[PDB]
């Protein structure tokens, strides 16, 4: 019911990625319904998705569709790789790094979707912090403050080539193991 | 006859009655017999010294029952380090120096500190752990709190209101040993530094493990938007598992924040303003299950509506109830014709705290005043409909008993309106809080007023305070001023000074709290044409030297972006001018050059930089504070003759 | 019941007023360790105890040093916990807010501290947050 | 530990064989690198210290005669490097500290492998033909303010003159941290900065220098990078990042930090 109710919209927007859209629709539906991974014995609200594949604009509008459907809000545009535009490089935030931006956005918006572009090109520190947040359920900012993840939808755009383990570099294997789901976008 | 001719029993009884530490130190220098009496009858000691010279600890204080080790310099420094094999000697030294300790307060920077110091006193009854730093990483949860469980133990009271940890540590430690949890009579978990409050399951487990609790305070999350939020089931489990409860204090983590922008619904960008999973029937069952309740506090950040019937049941089912604190409880007083209802039926109340009640009107205030005729302390926050007439009539009704009044964040009640409303009890009120709001539209001796608390927005002046009505206060001794706001958008003030010289109108003023720590600005780099926090510190601290202050707690304004609360040059220079200062506590950071300014004060004795905020600086490379600087400053201060 | 002072003055007393004192209740009833006015004020306080009040307790204490110490000794002898407690509190009130020299001057106390002793005591006192 | 390591608050972090030395600018201390240090400890050994004028150091150890010239700071840096057995270090310095590091490298070339420069300038006072700093009047006003603060403190009054009271709007940002020290020490350091002139010495620098500047910076002109590139005696490279303010490594970490790591890791120059 939930699966299709968001699946037909995802198909409407990204119809060239029907199989991947169906897979992530199922995963998001069971995660929100509670049939997903658990942070140990206790249930967790945070959902981490890995969206591989070379289709970037399709991926972006696709997560936008999920944001507008399940939560009725716009996505938050955090990038980590060599994709910076005139919007992400915000000098208004002042003394905030990428991890600081992620932590501040999570704190201010505990109920939304988070799109992390190019996790492959992210710094080692950022990936380690993401692993720590996925393990402990709390993300640490640059100043040591701990912030609860709430149930924030987390989607990270990689570019390796359902995600096969053979196409993932060894350094990212643990992230794929710990992540709730991995989806490979078709070319 | 004189004291030396009197029997020593009456002399000891007299000496035990001296509570001021300065007077006790003075009396210990009178004669040999007085020295022995004072050393034998001293009960509470707050240790003052450095970690380096801990082995120079005096052994005279053999009869102290309450020991406070949380203020050992450097503040927050690890008392015991596992990297040092001789750190185990500190435990033996403390055990030998204070063998009769029953209440202990210690800064638990490291689990080794707990494991070494706490088990030294088997007869320990009350324990308070303090930690404003990051939680050390452990393999499991609650490992550091498991070190409290001793084979020989009667810890009765546990206080974690200032001990930062994960909310899953407490249930894990309490479930490890049933005897330790069953022996607990008091449990304080009202920590505002928690990232989020306790889950429903964590609350259930904590209450299940401790069936003999008499006082219970906890920071819980009641937002239904989260998963596992505390709700009706958690409160029912609290009532069922702990029938002996006398104090129940449940509050949202945001409700405990110092900044009003965190819990005020009007100051949040649409946050809150939604019903919580708490019903009138659930509150009825909870209150029915707690016959021995004396103090109740439910400070939620989510609205609970039509709570009147529950408060009516409170009077019948809780005869011993004396204090009620309600947060975002609506319909607490909805009078019809003239019949009292809601909180107005609790005639046994002595103090009532009210926050963010939409349904409250003037008639509701009149009903509360007429029904709760025994009220001695009244506090109202965020009521948009109450006016000067209703508050004044309520104060006139409670004229015989009301001595503590707080009126904050009331739109139609400014400073002038609040002072006019408190006219009937002007000659009897002892503690008073008002908001320094001068923009509200629409015989005078405060004879017994001793404490005044003020809240003012950043950039506003203090001069109109005297003209507002707080003119003649012959007995005013302590004033607390809290300043909040974001100054990154304000311009340079047109008036040079905040107006601390206005406080010269009160001749008995000797203690001050200047809380500017909630001001957000620029610390060392402003973008362009902006003003750093040094200008605002100068604006606020000009004229502080003219006041005859003897104690001063100062909170430097913070820069949230770079996470620093440093002292600035004008602030240190102006604080140096206070010649009569005896104690000076700065809740921030300051490097050696500015700290050495304070040696010019001849009467200065107690100086400390206390980073009692979350998160405290982690090490010496994170801020401008160094352990060597603190040691040098302490040595120089103790060198002064 | 009628008591008797040490000097020979005999004063009457009520029943609960006498029951206020543990020594009197446990035990003519001669009182050879007390004076006359000492009995007057102690029984007056016991009366007021049988019958907001801090003003009365304060205005009671508007007496000289020597008579206050006589009240000290009498309250200890007759064993009233309230009398001993508030009289000792009154005594400790003069202790607060005075330097050791002031206390010695106002209490007739001879200083027997050598400068090295006073210095060691001060060094010990520096370990306490006042 | 050692007296040098205690007088300068020297801290050692990280691991590996290559050592990175971080030198803060005047008016700040080693805490300004708190955002850059985590990116380095994984694969580099980080040495942090405070020069003697810093507010976090003991004011008694400050020698007014020695620290009236940059050579005192250069000798202090050399002593710190030799005490902790540091060779071929990568020095990352802020304004007016990279100059001292360059002088030290002139004295001891073997100690430095490369120099990373964050908004440097050999001379802060503009001349008729040299435009690489500020006019004499705008810094004379700052010197007057510092002298007034020192005079007021000597009399027991509060020093109430601030960098935000200057009207240049570039003096306010540049000299903001100059009021973060004891007024006499601040006056001595500011006079040393005013009298500094390393233009003759630029030819003797042989170690590679990586110069980093802010785009269209209003305080230190971008032409200073080209002047240094032309006059430095060794290899050099100039990079421009879109930042602003006196402390880009603290107020704009997301932009300054990647450039600093790129220049630290890249050695071709």
From TrEMBL, chain B:
Domain COI1 F-box, residue spans: 6-43
Cellular component, GO annotation: nucleus; SCF ubiquitin ligase complex
InterPro entries attached to this UniProt entry: COI1_F-box, Leu-rich_rpt_Cys-con_subtyp, LRR_dom_sf
GO biological process: one example: SCF-dependent proteasomal ubiquitin-dependent protein catabolic process
SUPFAM superfamilies in UniProt: RNI-like (SSF52047)
CDD domains: F-box_AtTIR1-like
Protein name stated in the entry: F-box protein
Species per Swiss-Prot/TrEMBL record: Striga hermonthica
UniProtKB/TrEMBL annotation, chain D:
Domain spans labelled AB hydrolase-1: 20-256
A Pfam cross-reference name: Abhydrolase_6
GO terms for MF: hydrolase activity; metal ion binding
Keyword check for ATP-binding: no
Modified residue annotations for Cysteine sulfinic acid (-SO2H): 95
UniProt KW keywords: Hydrolase, Metal-binding
Residues that hold Mg(2+) according to the record: 231
Entry similarity comment: Belongs to the AB hydrolase superfamily.
Protein name: Hyposensitive to light 7
Organism, as annotated: Striga hermonthica (Purple witchweed)
């Amino acid at each position: 019911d939930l699966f299709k109710k968001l699946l037909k919209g995802m198909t409407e927007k990204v119809w060239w990625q029907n199989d991947a859209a169906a897979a992530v629709a199922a995963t998001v539906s069971q995660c929100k319904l509670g049939n997903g991974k658990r942070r140990g014995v206790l249930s967790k609200g945070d959902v981490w998705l890995l969206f591989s594949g070379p289709d970037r604009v399709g991926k972006r509008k696709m997560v936008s569709a999920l944001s507008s459907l399940v939560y009725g809000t716009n996505p938050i545009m955090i990038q980590l790789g060599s994709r910076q535009d005139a919007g992400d490089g915000n000098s208004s935030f002042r003394g905030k790094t990428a991890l600081d931006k992620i932590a501040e956005t999570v704190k201010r918006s505990p109920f939304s979707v988070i799109l992390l572009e190019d996790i492959d090109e992210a710094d080692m520190l950022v990936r380690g912090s993401i692993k720590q947040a996925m393990d402990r359920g709390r993300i640490r900012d640059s100043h040591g403050r701990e912030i609860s993840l709430g149930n924030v939808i987390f989607v990270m755009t990689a570019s390796w080539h359902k995600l096969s383990l053979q196409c993932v570099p060894f350094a990212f294997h643990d992230m794929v193991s710990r992540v709730d789901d991995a989806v490979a976008f078709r070319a | 006859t004189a004291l030396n001719d009197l029997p020593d029993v009456i002399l000891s009884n007299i000496m035990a009655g001296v509570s001021d530490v300065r007077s006790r130190n003075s009396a210990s220098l009178v004669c040999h017999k007085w020295y022995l009496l004072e050393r034998a009858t001293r009960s509470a000691l707050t240790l003052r010294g450095n970690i380096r010279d801990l082995f120079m600890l005096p052994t005279c204080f053999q009869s102290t029952s309450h020991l406070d080790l949380s203020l050992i310099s450097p503040w927050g420094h690890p008392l015991t380090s596992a990297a040092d094999p001789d750190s185990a000697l500190i435990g033996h030294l403390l055990r030998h120096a204070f063998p009769s300790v029953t209440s202990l307060a210690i800064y638990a920077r490291d689990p080794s500190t707990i494991h070494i110091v706490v088990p030294q006193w088997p007869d320990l009854e009350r324990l308070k752990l303090v930690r404003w730093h990051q939680r050390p990483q452990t393999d499991a949860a609650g490992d550091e709190l498991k070190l409290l469980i001793s084979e020989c133990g009667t810890l009765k009271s546990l206080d974690l209101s200032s001990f930062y940890c994960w909310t899953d540590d407490v249930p894990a430690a309490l479930g490890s040993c049933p005897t330790f949890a069953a022996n607990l009579k008091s449990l304080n978990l009202l920590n505002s530094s928690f990232s989020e409050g306790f889950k429903s399951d964590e609350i259930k487990a904590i209450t299940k493990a401790c069936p003999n609790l008499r006082e219970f305070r906890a920071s819980c999350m009641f937002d239904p938007r989260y998963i596992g939020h505390a709700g009706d089931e958690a409160l029912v489990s609290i009532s069922v598992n702990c029938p002996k409860l006398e104090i129940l204090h449940l509050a949202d983590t945001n409700a405990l924040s110092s900044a009003r922008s965190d819990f005020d619904p009007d100051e949040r960008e649409g946050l809150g303003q939604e019903e919580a999973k708490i019903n009138a029937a659930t509150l009825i069952e909870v209150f029915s299950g707690l016959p021995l309740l004396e103090e109740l506090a439910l400070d939620l950040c989510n609205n609970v509506r039509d709570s009147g019937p529950a408060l009516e049941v409170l009077n019948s089912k809780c005869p011993k109830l004396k204090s009620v604190k309600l947060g975002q409880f609506h319909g607490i007083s909805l009078p019809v014709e003239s019949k009292l209802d809601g909180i107005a039926l609790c005639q046994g109340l002595e103090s009532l705290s009210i926050r963010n009640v939409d349904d409250l009107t003037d008639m509701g205030l009149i009903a509360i005043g007429r029904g709760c005729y025994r009220l001695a302390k009244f506090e109202v926050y965020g009521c948009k409909k109450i006016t000067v007439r209703g508050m004044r009539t309520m104060a006139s009704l409670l004229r015989k008993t009301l001595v503590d009044v707080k009126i904050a964040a009331c739109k139609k009640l400014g400073a002038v309106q609040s002072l006019k409303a408190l006219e009937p009890i002007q000659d009897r009120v002892e503690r008073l809080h008002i908001d320094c709001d001068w923009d509200c539209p629409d015989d005078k001796t405060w004879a017994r007023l001793r404490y005044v608390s003020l809240w003012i927005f950043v950039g506003q002046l203090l001069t109109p305070l005297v003209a507002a009505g707080l003119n003649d206060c012959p007995e005013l001794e302590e004033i607390s001023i809290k300043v909040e706001g974001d100054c990154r958008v304000l311009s340079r003030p047109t008036v040079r000074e905040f107006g601390l010289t206005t406080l010269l109108n009160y001749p008995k003023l000797s203690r001050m709290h200047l809380d500017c720590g909630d001001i957000n600005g620029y610390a060392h780099t402003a973008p362009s044409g902006q003003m750093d926090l040094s200008l605002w510190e100068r604006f606020y601290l000009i004229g502080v030297g003219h006041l005859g202050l003897t104690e001063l707690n100062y909170w430097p304004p913070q820069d949230r972006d770079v996470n620093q609360r440093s002292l600035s040059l004008p602030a240190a220079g102006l604080l140096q001018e206070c010649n009569r200062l005896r104690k000076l506590f700065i809740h921030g950071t300051a490097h050696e050059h500015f700290m050495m300014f304070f040696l010019r004060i001849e009467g200065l004795r107690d100086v400390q930089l206390r980073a009692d905020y979350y998160p405290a600086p982690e090490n010496d490379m994170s801020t401008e504070m160094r352990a060597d600087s603190c040691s040098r400053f302490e040595v120089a201060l103790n060198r002064r003759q | 019941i009628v008591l008797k002072s040490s000097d020979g003055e005999s004063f009457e007393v009520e029943e609960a007023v006498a029951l206020e004192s543990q020594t009197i209740a446990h035990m003519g009833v001669p009182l050879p360790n007390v004076t006359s006015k000492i009995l007057a004020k102690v029984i007056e306080y016991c009366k007021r105890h049988v019958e907001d009040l801090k003003a009365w307790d304060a205005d009671f204490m508007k007496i000289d040093q020597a008579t206050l110490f006589e009240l000290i000794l009498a309250a200890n002898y007759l064993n009233i916990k309230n009398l001993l407690d508030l009289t000792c509190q009154t005594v400790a009130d003069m202790i607060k807010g005075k330097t050791p020299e002031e206390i010695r001057t106002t209490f007739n106390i001879k200083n027997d501290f050598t400068p090295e002793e006073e210095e060691e005591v001060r060094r010990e006192n520096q370990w306490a947050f006042e | 530990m050692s007296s040098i390591g205690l007088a300068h608050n020297v801290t050692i972090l990280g691991s590996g064989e290559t050592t990175v030395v971080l030198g803060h600018g005047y008016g700040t201390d080693q805490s300004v690198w708190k955002l850059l240090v985590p990116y380095l400890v994984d694969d580099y050994k980080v040495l942090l210290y405070d020069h003697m004028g810093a507010g976090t150091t003991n004011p008694d150890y400050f020698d007014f005669d020695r620290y009236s010239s940059l050579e005192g700071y250069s000798y202090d840096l050399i002593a710190i490097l030799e005490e902790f057995q540091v060779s071929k270090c990568i020095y990352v310095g802020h304004s007016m500290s990279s100059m001292a590091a360059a002088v030290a490298s002139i004295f001891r070339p073997d100690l430095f492998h490369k120099l990373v420069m964050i908004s440097p300038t050999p001379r802060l006072i503009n001349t008729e033909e040299y435009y690489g700093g500020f006019e004499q009047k705008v810094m004379d006003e700052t010197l007057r303010s510092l002298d007034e603060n020192f005079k007021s403190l000597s009399l027991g009054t509060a020093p109430l003159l601030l960098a935000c009271d200057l009207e240049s709007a570039a003096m306010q940002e540049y000299c903001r941290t100059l009021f973060n020290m004891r007024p006499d020490i601040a006056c001595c350091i500011t006079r040393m900065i005013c009298g500094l002139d390393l233009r003759p010495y630029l030819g003797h620098v042989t170690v590679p220098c990586h110069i980093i500047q802010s785009s269209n910076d209003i305080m230190v002109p971008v032409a200073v990078g080209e002047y240094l590139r032309k006059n430095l005696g060794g290899p050099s490279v100039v990079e421009v990042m879109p930042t602003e303010g006196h402390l880009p490594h603290l107020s704009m970490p997301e932009v300054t930090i990647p450039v600093v790591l790129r220049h630290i890791r890249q050695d071709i120059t």
